[PDB]
């Protein structure tokens, strides 16, 4: 087995980790365990710290800022007498190879923390990846008040990720009935998806059934896969952006039924102009898929992403009320979009 390592600009400090991606199982998260190699030759400040930081990065010309959401600090050197932690198997392997000079560090990620999400940049952006990202920074100083010198430190980007649940949810199904006043005639819309859990790049099948017992006519049927992003930092923000769509000219005449299966597949190639779109966290600048739906058990910081399919019937009423009163009929179907658990 191999492990990751990164050194400070002048080499005096070297971090070691076992993996970059840490899985959030909701009930627990994979711990961030590692070691920091320090030589006595370059050990003058005589205090080495390690910090885990969950930060929201945001932007005029490529300038960015990091607001901390969760920060945790561990004093690797010296080992204070009032804190003795047992080493992980990964850590004890690392000391066995490196020696005493390697000082361990172990962070526990609490639940209800945001996952690593990167907001899509435009072609005219040169700054670092904006969004929510985790980061492990090891440095040495005389005390925590001292200003850390960029060369006496090292930072490594890590990600907090989730994977598809083992048990699939119930089949997403939804109904709605629009009843008009001119006559006692209902316009019924029923829609359903093939399954509850979908993987990225996989097709979504929307079964649509319309029972039009009214005098009006359905001119167009609009299907769309829409990404819901809830961003809770200061106050509140949120938006819906359609990662897939189809505008069928299928018509439902009065006093007639209609039934058709629409198949949509959300992918990034046709969404590269939608700046701010939620994507799965980027290590540095790697191309990543549409952000996976984050699952929360029972107002949580960071970017919370979900997905819904909207089926809208465009109706032309006319008659008594003319075109003043809208007669459109829509329904929505929530679903999960994330990657399978790597075996």
């Amino acid at each position, epitope marked *: 087995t191999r492990v990751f390592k990164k050194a400070s600009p002048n080499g005096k400090l070297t971090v070691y980790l076992g993996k970059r991606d840490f899985v959030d199982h909701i009930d627990l998260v994979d711990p961030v365990d590692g070691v920091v190699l320090v030589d006595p030759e370059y050990l003058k400040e005589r205090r080495v710290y390690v910090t885990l930081t969950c930060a929201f990065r945001y932007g005029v010309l490529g300038l960015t800022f990091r607001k901390d959401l969760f920060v945790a600090n561990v004093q690797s050197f010296p080992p204070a007498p009032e804190d003795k932690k047992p080493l992980t198997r990964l850590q004890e392997r690392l000391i066995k190879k490196l020696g005493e000079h390697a000082y361990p560090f172990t962070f526990e990620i609490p639940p209800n923390l945001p996952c690593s999400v990167t907001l899509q940049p435009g072609p005219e952006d040169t700054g670092k990846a904006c969004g929510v990202d985790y980061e492990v920074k090891a440095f040495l100083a005389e005390n925590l008040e001292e200003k850390i010198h960029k060369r006496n430190s090292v930072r490594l980007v890590i990600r907090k990720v989730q994977y598809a649940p083992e048990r699939p949810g119930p089949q997403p199904t939804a109904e709605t009935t629009r009843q008009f006043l001119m006559s006692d005639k209902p316009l019924h819309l029923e829609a359903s998806l093939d399954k509850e859990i979908y993987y990225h*790049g*996989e097709p979504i099948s929307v079964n649509v059934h319309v029972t039009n017992n009214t005098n009006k006519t359905v001119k167009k049927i609009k299907i769309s896969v829409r990404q819901y992003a809830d961003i809770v930092l200061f106050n509140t923000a949120q938006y819906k952006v359609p990662v897939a769509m189809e505008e069928a000219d299928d018509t439902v005449a009065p006093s007639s039924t209609f039934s058709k299966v629409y198949t949509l597949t959300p992918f990034l190639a046709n969404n590269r102009e939608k700046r701010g779109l939620a994507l799965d966290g980027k290590l540095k600048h790697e191309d990543t898929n549409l952000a996976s739906s984050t699952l929360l058990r029972e107002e949580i910081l960071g970017i919370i992403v979900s997905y819904k399919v909207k089926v809208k019937l465009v109706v032309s009423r006319g008659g008594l009320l003319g075109d003043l009163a809208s007669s459109d009929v829509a329904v929505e179907l929530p679903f999960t979009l994330m990657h399978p658990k790597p075996k």
Partner: antibody
Amino acid sequence: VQLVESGGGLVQPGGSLRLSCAASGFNVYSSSIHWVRQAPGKGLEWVASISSYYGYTYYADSVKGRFTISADTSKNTAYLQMNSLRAEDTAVYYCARSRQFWYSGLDYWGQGTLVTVSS
Amino acid sequence: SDIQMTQSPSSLSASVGDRVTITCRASQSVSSAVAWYQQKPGKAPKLLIYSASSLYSGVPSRFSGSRSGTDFTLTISSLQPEDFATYYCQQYKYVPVTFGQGTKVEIKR
């Protein structure tokens, strides 16, 4: 699941030939359609790749500026359009499958039609 | 100006039930991004191991993989009638991806 190749045949040097492979059991966006070039007793040589989910094309340096890789996402087919064929490009071209998220190697191949280039 | 693979075995020959090993040294470190393949004559290749040591599904238990820096290996616990084909070493960290020359694994008579 199956991959089917067609469009292989003899073409004079400097000519043009086109190849396509059917896809069954694989979604175009959930996979990437690689291509390979193994002449008899010469070994595998990757010629081109297409990523439908990220809309990227990749070409071998020798291939660059000559073959074009495309994909009709509806019919689930990938079309390698070969232009300005050299006599050296005579080989059995296979069409491979890869996991779009994330790369797992070439886990499935088609039988591969025979391509010949000579005067 | 591209990474090249160096399968050390050229024409391995062994009897049934033997433990055979095949090693390919990457020109420069390609990390654990290494795959092994099996190709019968007149047939298309099959995938055996991915990520250097992660056995693929639909492959026997006998197959397994390891890494020694630039040297990546392919080991079969017991050799079988089915397992008598030319094998290959691949790298997919840097594009273009490249393969090995091929090893002529054959029966002993």
